[model samples]
Target: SFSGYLKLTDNVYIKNADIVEEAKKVKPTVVVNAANVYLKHGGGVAGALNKATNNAMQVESDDYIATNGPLKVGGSCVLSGHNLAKHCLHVVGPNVNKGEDIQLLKSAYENFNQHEVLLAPLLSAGIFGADPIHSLRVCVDTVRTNVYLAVFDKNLYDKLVSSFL
Candidate 1:
C-alpha cells in the first residue's frame, strides 16, 4: 500500500492517489491543476473540478485568465468562488512536444512552490498529454514543493514511484 512518495524535505512530499478525492479530506490551502489558457475543463482533472464545483470553478477560471491573459508554461491564474479549496491555481503547462520538455513543467512548479500545502495533479500527462517515457517523468522535476501528485492510473503511479520513491 506504500504506493508512491518523494519527500524532498520534511514539509515536501510527493505522493500519489486518486486526485479527485484525495484533497477532500486533507483540504490543502490550494488545489493546483495544469490548465489551458482558455480555462476550459472539458477533460482531465479540470473536467473533474468543473463537475465538482457546480461549474462555478470554470466561471472563476475564465474571469481570472481573461484579465490575467492566457498563461504560458509555469504562469498561473488564481480563481475563487469554489468549495473545492480556498483557492485554485491553474498553471498553463507546455504543450507536449518532441523535445525541450522539462523547461515549462519545471517553471509551473516553481510557481506552485509559493504555497506551503498543495494538492496537485500531474503537470503534463493524461489530459495535458505526453510520451517517450523520458519526457513523461519530467513531471517529477516540474513540481517544487510539498506535493502529492494524485493519479488514477496504477501504471503511472508505479512508474513515478519507481523513479521518485
Candidate 2:
C-alpha cells in the first residue's frame, strides 16, 4: 500500500528582496497635488447677445435701491441677474460725489434691465467720505461701458441718467 501527500508551500515569498540591492529597475516617481481654481468675468450687451445666439445663453439684469449709512461718492452696489448664457452680475460703480441725481438714473437703468436687483454697499475706493463729488467723478470716469445706474441718492440721482429712458 502507498500513500500520497502534497507538500505545503510558504504563503509569503519574496524573490530578489535585498533591501540594499541596487537593481537596474526604474524607480517610482512621486506626483505632487495642487488646487487649481479659476474665476471668469463675462462681457457686455454685444458680448451677451453673441453668447446667447452662439451658445444658447440667456440675458438678464439686476438693480439695487438704498443702503445703510451715508452713501459716499462713486459708491457701488452689485446686482445679480440672468443672461442667455447663464447668470449675470452687474456692479453699479457710480460717482456719488457728483450727486445722487445722476447715480439714480444709472441705477434705474440697471434695475430696468436686471432680472434681480440688490442695493450693495460701497466698494473700497468708491467711498470718498466728505468729498462725495470726487467719488462721483471717479466712478463716472472709471466704470466700463454697458452697466446701468439705478437707485441713487435723491439729490444726486437726478444728476445722473435714468433707467426708463
Candidate 3:
C-alpha cells in the first residue's frame, strides 16, 4: 500500500489515486474538462460529476460557449451560475494521440493561469488515448499555478511516487 503525494509548487501536489476519492477531498475550484467539457457528461468521473452537479457544468459551459466559444485545442471557458467554485476553466483538451498530445496539454497548462484548486486530468488521455505518462511529463513542465491546485491522473500523481519518490 502506498500513500503518496509529490509537491509540484507550493500549492500543487501530485497523486497516483483516481479522481473519484481525490476530488471529494480536494474540492477543486476548476477542472480542465475532467467532466462536462461538452454538452453531456458521458461516463467515468465526468458522468458522476454530471449526476452530482445536475449538468451545471454543461449548462454553464454552454452559456459561455454561446458567447465566445468554438475554441481550439487548449481553449477554455469560464463557467458560472451553479456556484461550484470561485471560477471554472473548461479546457478544450487536445484531440490528439500518443506523442502528438504533449504540446496541447503543455499549452493548456502554460496558459491556464487562473484557479485556486485547479483540477485537470492528463489531457487527451481519454478518447484521444494519449499515453498518460508521456503527456504527463509535458504537463508538469508547463504548469505554474498561482494558486492552490491539484490535477488528477496527471503527471503530478504518478511522478510523485514513481521518479519523484
Candidate 4:
C-alpha cells in the first residue's frame, strides 16, 4: 500500500491512502465527498464515489438539491451511502479564483458533526484552486471529529507530516 501516517493529538491522523477503500473497512463511517455547489457528481472524488455507488449518490444528490436547494459554498449535506460507507457528507468548498475566501473553505469543515470516523480528502485543493498546503492546514486544524486526513498524493503526505507533525 502506498500509504503513510502521523498522529495529530489522540483523535486526528494525517495519512495517505485510498479513501474509498479505507472507508469500506470500518463501520458507520462517513466519507467526505468533495462536492460542487450544485451537488452534481461530476468529477474527482465526487465522480469516483458516484461510480463506486453506481450513481445512487448522484440520484440522491439530485433529489437533495431538488428539495433543499443547491448547496451553498462552504455548505454541506448528508446522504446514506451504498456499498462503501454508512454516510456521505457532501461539502461545497470555496473557489479561490472566484473571490471566495479561505475562511469559506474552513467553514465547510466546521459544518459537520463528529462521526465515528470521517475520511476526508483535501477539500478545495483540486479544481477549486486553493493551495493544497493551506487546505491541509485548515483541514487539520478545523476538523472536530475523529478524522483521517486522507491524502491521495504521496508527496502531499510527506509535506503534511513535515509541516505539521
Q: Which TM-score value belongs to model 1?
A: 0.79
Per-residue accuracy of model 2 over 5-61 as CA lDDT, tens digit each: 111112111121111110112111110000001101233222332243343222212
Give, for candidate 2, the lowest lDDT window spanning 10 residues: 30-39
lDDT per residue as tens, model 4, 87-106: 88888888786678778988
Task: In model 2, state the lDDT of residue 71.
Answer: 24
Model 4 root mean square deviation, Cα atoms: 2.6
- Which regions of candidate 3 deviate over 4 angstroms? 1-4, 8-12, 35-40, 81-84, 97-102, 146-160, 163-165
Per-residue lDDT tens digits of candidate 1, residues 91-144?
777667534355677676677777766777767677565642443355455444
TM-score top scorer = 4
* Steric overlap count per candidate: 2, 43, 1, 0
Model 2: CA > 4 A from native: 1-131, 159-165
RMSD of each: 3.7, 28.8, 4.8, 2.6
Pick the lDDT winner.
4
TM-score of each: 0.79, 0.22, 0.68, 0.87
Instruction: Kindly report which residue stretches of model 1 are placed more than 4 angstroms away from their true locations once superposed.
Output: 1-15, 97-102, 131-144
Q: Rank the candidates by TM-score, best first.
A: 4, 1, 3, 2
- Displacement of residue 96 (Cα, Å) in model 4 is 2.1
Candidate 4's displacement at residue 127, Å, is: 2.3
Ten-residue segment with the worst summed lDDT in candidate 3?
146-155
